[PDB]
Amino acid sequence: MRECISIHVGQAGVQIGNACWELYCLEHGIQPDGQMPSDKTIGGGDDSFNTFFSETGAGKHVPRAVFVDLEPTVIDEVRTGTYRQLFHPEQLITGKEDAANNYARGHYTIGKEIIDLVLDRIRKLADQCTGLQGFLVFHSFGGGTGSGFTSLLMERLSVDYGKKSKLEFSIYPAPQVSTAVVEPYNSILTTHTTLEHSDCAFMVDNEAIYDICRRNLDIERPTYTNLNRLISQIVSSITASLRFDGALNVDLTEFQTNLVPYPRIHFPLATYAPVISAEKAYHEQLSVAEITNACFEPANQMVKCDPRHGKYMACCLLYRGDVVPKDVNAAIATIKTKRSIQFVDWCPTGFKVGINYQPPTVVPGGDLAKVQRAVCMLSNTTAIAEAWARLDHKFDLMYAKRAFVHWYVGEGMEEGEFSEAREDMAALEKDYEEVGVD
């Protein structure tokens, strides 16, 4: 067995980490006090769930996770919440003043003061691993901590753990749920410096999660709690292959091999169905073909864009629940004759499929309904570049007037990095254009 260490950075990363680990415990039958009645290997074991949880002699199962925020109010809620017993204190690291949505403040000013401590605490978990695979880093593009410190952390993890894979779960900024106008700056800056150090990044536009919550759960004004419990379902479906017995996506390296032919273009598009409200007391359960079809409706994607006008480089279908291969092939045959699905000429036109028979787990008292079967499609499509263009344009509008730039230069940055990063995004946007148009 090979362990995976999760790192949750900034408010968004931390709060989403709370949702994931809450869901993980329910999926594995672990109680809030860390006891696991179903585990008969007391004090140890190399089972599949042990990739994410270590075991103590007392029988407590402990997430291989580190939480880190530059201000404590968010992690303080972890230290006192339902799962306070799950984590032991040195896993939770807090500063005193945050980065004020300033990439430079998080990366340079405050980053330098706390980077060594964080790495030391990460090394204390890596020392408990017999065959560490890599890291899963949860953070926001928009926040100062989530953007600036994460990039710093990613840089030094590539030096101290050179041959270990690093996966990102990144929250793409949306005006509907943000109170910050400088997020485009932080998004471009962090992407530029993190790009070379990330093997696979799953991007989640808060705009997508917002509409999905109100359209499919009839929640009039979703909160972060609504959004995080939905995101955790997707995160779980993506990470389930690492935590349960299986053949597909069992090593972090397989995510890169299956989903990323070119290193720079490592942003797969996630699509998830079915999202069903708990208020609908009796619902017409959806067939395999209906949820598989739903994977190609932009309204169900984690990032709004049109794959019809891009090209696919890889596709994985991660079913959870009562699904058998035959029903999948039936749907795929029908779907291909009814949808615009063009692969690049230098890649096969095929789906890598995986099925876990355990149905999706929903947190008691949540907003989601329990369903018989669900699917998360991971697609590396050029259409995701639309999200970069949107962001690049917002960056351009403010930078032409140098708006807000003084806040970054005042923290030690040079204007060069703004144009240096923006130029990198220009290439990235043009790299997507080469691969998928004409």
Binding site: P175, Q176, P298, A299, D306, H309, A385, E386, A389, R390
Partner: protein, 349 residues
């Protein structure tokens, strides 16, 4: 009240639409780069579709269908027809055409030309390309060598298409023509055919033995007005409207425009637009789309209709701007942004 933006200055049609929306008293125009808009009268090239539908609390509409170029570029249109099972190589209303890069179909073009040459079938051909506008870039011949040589001389793509040697010829004049039809597709993908079409008329008598002359075989209004001495001999501006053409067919050939030609027109429109419906439809998309299309047909002497091209940024006939432009706002825009008989034939599908 609603807002909109103009991003195409050289647009005849939508110049009147913006003009007429303003005069409504419920529409407000903004700069060419203010995203806080309800409607975008976008540009013909590199319209930023990716930046639409991401403004909170703003329904956003645009007057173009992303991907509609596959029907409005001559080379792509050929590959769409030949490779679409809904249309197929066995297409009765499209002339046997081939895409020739100066993927490529050079042999297979010569393939039938040889079989046709041996069979004494009038193997007269034409080459075309979407780049050459203003009647520049057009070659007609009877043997490939002289035509294919012209293709290689230029550096862009060119399609070779069977020139139709037996067009329906009007009298008096013994002259050629094409038919232009305007079709509006709204956000719901209803297909609306404008009840008024126009014939772009050739003012010179047809001559099959002589294509040396550069005006007896093309009739795009511009050519006739700049390279023909009889621009307007028979009708105002080389433009004959349906009422007159219908009366002519009744008197000369004892038939109607609706029966002899307009049924085939409505079938080709439906066939083309429904073929691409799953690739451009915006029914469940974060932004909606409509678009005005200009289909160009022609009629042979057996009263069969042939589609020649589809134009995605078409101009209108001078007389009909008012009525048509008013029709767009009614069906395409107001249908989405309500306010305080019909001129369209709904092509049902």
């Amino acid at each position: 009240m609603y807002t909109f933006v103009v991003r195409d200055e050289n647009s005849s049609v939508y110049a009147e639409v913006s003009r007429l929306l303003l005069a409504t008293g419920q529409w407000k125009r903004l700069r060419k780069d203010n995203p806080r808009f309800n409607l975008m009268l976008g540009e013909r090239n590199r319209l930023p579709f990716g930046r639409l539908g991401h403004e909170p609390g703003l329904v956003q509409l645009v007057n173009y269908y992303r991907g509609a170029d596959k029907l409005c570029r001559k080379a792509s249109l050929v590959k769409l027809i030949k490779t679409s099972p809904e249309l197929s190589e066995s297409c009765t209303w499209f002339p046997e055409s081939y895409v020739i890069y100066p993927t490529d179909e050079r042999e297979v073009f010569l393939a039938a030309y040889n079989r046709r040459r041996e069979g004494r079938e009038g193997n007269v051909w034409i080459a075309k390309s979407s780049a050459g506008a203003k009647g520049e870039g057009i070659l007609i011949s009877s043997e490939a060598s002289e035509l294919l040589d012209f293709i290689d001389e230029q550096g862009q793509v060119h399609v070779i298409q069977k020139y139709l040697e037996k067009p329906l010829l009007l009298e008096p004049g013994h002259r050629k023509f094409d038919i232009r039809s305007w079709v509006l597709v709204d956000h719901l993908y209803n297909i609306y055919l404008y009840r008024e079409g126009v014939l772009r008329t050739s003012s010179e008598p047809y001559n099959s033995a002589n294509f040396q002359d550069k005006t007896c075989h093309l009739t795009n209004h511009c050519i006739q007005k700049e390279y023909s001495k009889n621009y307007g001999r028979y009708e105002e501006g080389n433009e004959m409207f349906f009422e007159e053409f219908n009366q002519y067919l009744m008197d000369a050939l004892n038939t109607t425009l609706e029966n002899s030609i307009l049924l085939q027109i409505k079938h080709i429109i439906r066939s083309c637009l429904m073929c691409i419906e799953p690739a451009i439809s915006t029914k469940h998309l974060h932004y909606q789309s409509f678009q005005l299309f200009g289909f160009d047909f022609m009629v042979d002497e057996e009263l069969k209709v042939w589609l020649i091209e589809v134009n995605g940024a078409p101009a209108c006939a001078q007389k009909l701007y008012a009525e048509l432009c008013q029709g767009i706002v009614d069906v395409a825009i107001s249908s989405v942004f309500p306010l305080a008989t019909s001129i369209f034939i709904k092509l049902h599908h």
